[PDB]
Amino acid sequence: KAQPTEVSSILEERIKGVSDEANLNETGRVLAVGDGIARVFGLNNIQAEELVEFSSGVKGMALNLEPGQVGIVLFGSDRLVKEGELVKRTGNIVDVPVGPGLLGRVVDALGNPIDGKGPIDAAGRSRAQVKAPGILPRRSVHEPVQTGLKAVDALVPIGRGQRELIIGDRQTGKTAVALDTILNQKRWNNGSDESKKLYCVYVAVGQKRSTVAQLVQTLEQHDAMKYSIIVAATASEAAPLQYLAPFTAASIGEWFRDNGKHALIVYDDLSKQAVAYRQLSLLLRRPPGREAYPGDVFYLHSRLLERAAKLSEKEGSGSLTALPVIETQGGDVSAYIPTNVISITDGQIFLEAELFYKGIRPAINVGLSVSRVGSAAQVKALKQVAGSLKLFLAQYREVAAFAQFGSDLDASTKQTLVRGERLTQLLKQNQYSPLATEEQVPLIYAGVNGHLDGIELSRIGEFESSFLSYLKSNHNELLTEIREKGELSKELLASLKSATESFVAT
Template identity: 55%
Template structure:
């Protein structure tokens, strides 16, 4: 038998068969792409906002899946026979039988300074027509809340610029303060003024619109731009015409964006507007995915979806950067029913609530904060000392006034003390009024409220109160700037400082009286 032909080379004898095998193997290595095993499933049912998929046995909870038309979804229900997928895009061109692929990625969102000033959707895609976002990193939208031992006490105020809030319902950095009330009572206005008041501070802001009309969201963005607030603000939008999956994911994505700054040692304010619509979106998804309904058709874990969201707001200790995340969730009530299901859930999760009354709103008392039904369980410890020196008297006099005002409606003859209390209370209420987009600096707030609690405005007509307030604010800035600096630095006011404030405020009020008398004399 003839020997097999061989080729002589420097490395020894190599058979032609072995050489041919090596050449073919090398050619395949260069010419053919690496094959990758991917799970593929098929859609068995498509509903309004959800799809059911079979054939993805190892898919993870909250994993992104991609349909053959390029649309995205998130695996939410992991049943034995099928997977319940929440659609994150419109269901156009998606039918039963369509192919579905795993991506291997848990739903995440871009984070970083590149998102400042941008408007994005619930999964971080830009919707402001300003080009792509160049983010250095992505983080999962669902993250564990910081451990209890990693947190520090709330000890720094989050100034809203609203007198009634900063003096009577103070908020601290790292606190969760609920804003609730009926429709059209100014809930968004309170949150928006708080964002605008951070313009001269080191606080970053995230505004999350959930289920809102596009026109309403556009109005908020326009206001932020007009008042130069977009430079330190990110807006996350899941509009009312978006799939319910995006509305459900939006607040978690916004919190992940905010946590990036908190973990970098910065202070952040986040507004969820509003969690009533968030709860409705989750109820819709749950019912479509055939989860058992509970009270008012909400699933049993409706409390958990909000608690795991709001628990991420906190103040970290110095070992973890010392940053803070302050949450202002908004919730809508119906017919002033604070004891409804979702509002009571959120009241029990948060650290206090600011209640906006439709009755006060209709009377033109804006912001329409009902002081009697509002409370802050944390912020008082973080309140500036200058506020604490007069907030107690202010709250007491206002509460007495509200009780007497109701009583006085049934009687015609009132003693002098009651009349004085009513007159003083009406001026307190007038001082607590404030126009939107006009947040007031701390020192000016303290000066005006200090003058009010000491009765300097009791001799003026109600119509003269706004002018008196303006003059006091101007006089304090011009005449006692050192006391203003002392207040803003968080120092207590000694007797000399209080006397100086009273002197300046009294002179401002007297100038109104003198001008009024001079005007009467000329007439």
């Protein structure tokens, strides 16, 4: 067509200019390749973590700079590159396109357009490795993030800027809760107030291309692709792609954050990123530190997740909410990679396989799922109702274990046990069903205030739907008041109490 011709002419003119300018400013001869790591001679004054051009066409980057030989990890298939290939250096640190044009576009780790929808329009290029903001640039997490899960994700919130972990086994709902959060962000990014929009960005690292295709299909089915970036590295490409894709997603997240906007990033299954770094380090001549893992895995998780922060008003008040995901084996949260990531994050969301198999689709264990925004960085309506409900539910679980231990004044005779079991049955959700914050307070308020003593565990599922229909049909006054105010006052508390003990009889 017309555009390819002029684009090709302009770019080849620039190519001739580059070839005729300063020679190439450095080169190298390939000494070894394999598993996406390539040794190369030359490159005497190569910059650290610097992109390099290979004669075949594969990209590269410099993790290691030995005397004489340079450790280059190959960005793509290593089949094309051979021995003696000339390795031109790009002259700049590893970068990735960042800007508002990445919205609605799927790109690789390097930022090149892979969805085939056209070129990427970026305001600038940001380094994949960027130092995290300092103490003063960081701000206390106070702005809520509407997870839309109608579960413990609401009573103990996420908030804007938290790196709330999502631990659990495979196929437990980590990607499910991530996509529900992304879908629920549509209600707030579909407006005009940029201070409340959450421009999501997905990191589908170590995810099969069929799965990510289904994920993007589901996103655009719900009109969620307009605000979500799917920068990722599937299982098809090499390990360095997997290692760098979350970091470039972090770069996009800081671009959104440094511009005063709020972005939600979900590092889906960082485990493949860690093992990709393992694959790099095994043949890059970096000895492993512990449990066959190189020591720098904790450091890389640190730099990647600490970039996620809530900026202060001086820096633009931007937020970079992070939702890291780890795939543990057999629920072993005491393994190495778990221990580091649970110590790297601001709380976690446990998703055990037994709860998923039991029937609870969210499958979240209240007892261990903690956060640093307890009754903070919430709407306010939910924070007053269930500011300390997690501890009560944990004590309910302990007493229920204690209740089965011996026959005493326990079981149904315990008001705490009854309230805990009713609340645990309350905290459930179906996938692809984002529930707004307004239709979440009455259920938890009925649970916490002991209004569910005579509703029975089996009937709580129907009670949820009946109560929500009650509010959305003939009690929309207080519901809309809560939604618009973002808080339940004395008037709103009294109205909600009126509704709940009027509907307790049904």
